[PDB]
Design a protein around this ligand. Structure first.
Ligand SMILES: OCc1cn2ccsc2n1
Ligand SMILES: OCc1cn2ccsc2n1
Ligand SMILES: OCc1cn2ccsc2n1
Ligand SMILES: [Cl-]
Ligand SMILES: [K+]
Ligand SMILES: [Zn+2]
Ligand SMILES: [Zn+2]
Ligand SMILES: [Zn+2]
Lengths: 148, 153, 158
């Protein structure tokens, strides 16, 4: 069977006067992520990981973030691949993310037409190190397994 | 078959006053991590990720009365993975540290992790990098670990 | 069905007076990557992912930055030797995915050429090789153009 892996990375700046939206979840917070889209860093990383596993290039070449994630899933099926699983990590010093994880996972599973058991989201701080540790941005990493 | 992938990430600050333990191995150095075993946490997270069981924070709470060092957590991680129905196929990882030289300690880390995961030694890999003097990592202010894991249901 | 995954990371400083070589592509630029070999950050990251999947250690060990024979070494030759060792250990490569993170220059015009180089070196079709390019959204040493980072993932089978 023809399995493929993909990995994705994203980061966005935390700025005043934007809502904080991660994995489709709006999180109460003084700042939000800056981007041309809704800057959903988690969804962007998953999107890149899915495009990478299908060898379809990247999000910058192809393109709210859930609509884009749905379009990615479409283009991935279009190339003849089915999604097996997604795993990810959010790196954010603040705010606390644990209470929103299940919602993110629910959002992603719905967007990718996957059961909850094939979608995972993990949260981490950066132990006060670098721009992430100073709360200047939020990073997401993703890994996706697909099969043709 | 029903294969799944997971990925893991971890970082800790590097300062005088603590031992340096990476992958179960105490390494002589003028600094240490605030056991704070970056490599084992990353691998733990990667395993929980592949299993879709959340993350290290949800399983082993920083307050929970039952928690032990990072090898014990790794061992526990692996039993939870097994019970969800998953066999571990392989782990690969990278440690990024500007100093000390990590190459000498890799075989011991691979041995500890393989022991802890009940894996054949040739299914466990650890790699070493510096940050080429860039950022907090390159200034020796912290050490990062990265992990990938493949499992099967 | 004996599948294995590997992952890779690399970063090099971006300095004046060096060629900029990423994915085997020499990119016109006033700066280039600093290292012992040609400093091709993307190929090193993929090489690490491949050694990692086969559990063969790492590129720093197979191709040491302290060994003079690798001075100015062609990282495509290094990737091809890696692939040869991975094959020798019994693995076939199934796919590679990767990311390059750089403030500058624009990498989109060069991505297809990089993909082509990697596919050639690994004896893979283009449809099993992927290279993604981003910026770091102006953040950190990458945002300041002090270095270029690459990340990689590889799937192999014994
Ligand atoms: O680098 C942040 C970023 C750029 N980009 C383009 C499409 S989605 C997206 N995220
Ligand atoms: O980011 C450092 C860190 C946080 N955390 C929570 C459980 S194990 C662990 N390492
Ligand atoms: O850390 C940058 C680096 C060192 N090294 C040794 C062989 S390939 C390579 N890239
Ligand atoms: Cl940037
Ligand atoms: K990083
Ligand atoms: Zn983004
Ligand atoms: Zn940790
Ligand atoms: Zn390198």
């Amino acid at each position: 069977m023809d399995f493929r892996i993909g990995q994705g990375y994203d980061v966005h700046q935390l700025v005043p006067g934007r809502p904080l939206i991660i994995g489709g979840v709006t999180i109460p917070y003084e700042r939000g992520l800056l981007g041309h889209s809704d800057a959903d860093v988690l969804l962007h990383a998953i999107t890149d990981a899915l495009f990478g596993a299908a060898a379809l290039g990247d999000i910058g070449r192809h393109f709210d973030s859930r609509a884009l994630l749905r379009e990615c899933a479409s283009r991935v099926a279009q190339a003849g691949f089915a999604i097996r699983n997604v795993d990810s990590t959010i790196i954010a010093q603040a705010p606390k993310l644990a209470p929103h994880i299940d919602a993110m996972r629910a959002n992603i599973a719905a967007d990718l037409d996957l059961p909850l058991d094939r979608v995972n989201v993990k949260a981490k701080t950066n132990e006060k190190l670098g721009y992430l540790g100073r709360g200047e941005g939020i990073e997401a990493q993703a890994a996706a397994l697909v099969v043709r």
